[PDB]
């Protein structure tokens, strides 16, 4: 339905959020503001890790939703605070602790992904 963007991060929208993610082993949603100024920092700062990430093996794609329109989206997931990043793993959200720079949140979401050894 949604396809014309020219870059590594995705659009999820509440209309194509669950129906995206659910088909994403493992990837990470972004909620931000085209008014929120923190945000501004962040764009590049995501943008750019999702590049690395891309690149990365095994590759894990990100997404940006903007809880402004997604509000309902935002709502679910208790968002009242941007930037508000979020793991999801085949339709499980997961608070996302960690650094919100390029290379920290690259470095993080890889360990995320399985780190070393892991099970299930």
Known sequence: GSSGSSGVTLSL??????????????ILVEFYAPWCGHCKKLAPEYEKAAKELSKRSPPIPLAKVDA???TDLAKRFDVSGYPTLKIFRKGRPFDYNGPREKYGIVDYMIEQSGSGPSSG
């Open 13 to 26: 929208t509440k209309d194509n959020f669950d129906d995206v993610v659910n088909n994403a082993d493992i």
């Open 68 to 70: 402004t329109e997604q």
